[PDB]
Write a protein that binds this ligand. Sequence first.
Ligand SMILES: Cc1nnc(C2CC2)n1-c1ccccc1
Ligand code: NA
Length: 214
Amino acid sequence: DTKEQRILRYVQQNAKPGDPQSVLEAIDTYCTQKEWAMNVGDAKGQIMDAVIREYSPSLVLELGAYCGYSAVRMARLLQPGARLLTMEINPDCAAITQQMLNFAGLQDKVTILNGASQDLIPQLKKKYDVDTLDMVFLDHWKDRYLPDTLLLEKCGLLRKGTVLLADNVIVPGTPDFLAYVRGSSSFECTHYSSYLEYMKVVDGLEKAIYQGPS
Ligand SMILES: Cc1nnc(C2CC2)n1-c1ccccc1
Ligand code: NA
C-alpha cells in the first residue's frame, strides 16, 4: 500500500465523479490535514492555473506525475481539442494518475506515457505526431530538469513562446536548471515564490518562455 493509493481511495470516497474541482479539493484536504505530498498546494496550484489561462496551450507536456493532481489541475483548464501528454517513469504512479484522471472525467484529454522522459522525449515526433509543445511542466526528478530541457531543444520540440513551468525549484531545489535558463538568452524567466506555511520554508516555481535560437 502506497501514499498515492491512499490519496486515490480518499478522492473516491470524498469527491464527486466527473467533477475536477471536487477532486482537487479532496486532494488538497488530504495532503494538508493527513499526509503531505510535494506536488500539491494551492500557492503552486493557482500559479499553474494562471499560466494555463494566460497562454491557452493546445499541447502540454508534463514530466512527472504522482497521484494525478497536477494533470487533473491542468487538464481541467485545457480548451476543447487541447491535449496533455504525461510522462511518468514509476508505473504505479502512472496507474494511479490514470485512475485519478478517469475519476475526474478528464481521461479523453490526457495520454499517459510510462517511461523515463529522457527516452520518451526523442520519440514524440515520430511516435505521437508531436511537432512543437506550447507548454512543458517539469515536476519529475530534480536531476532531470536541466538534461531534459536540453533534449527538448535538441529535438526541436520548443518554439518561440513555448512556456516551461518548473515546480520545486527551491525545495528540494533545481539550481543547475535555474542557472541554465536565467543565464541563457534563449529563455525569459519569472520566478514565483511560494511560502509553505506548514514547513516554515520558502519554495518556488520558475517560468521560462523559450525565445528560439538566434
Ligand atoms: C548549465 C549552465 N548554464 N549556465 C550555468 C551557470 C551560470 C553559469 N550552468 C551551470 C554551470 C555549473 C553548474 C551548473 C549549471
Ligand atoms: Na535568461
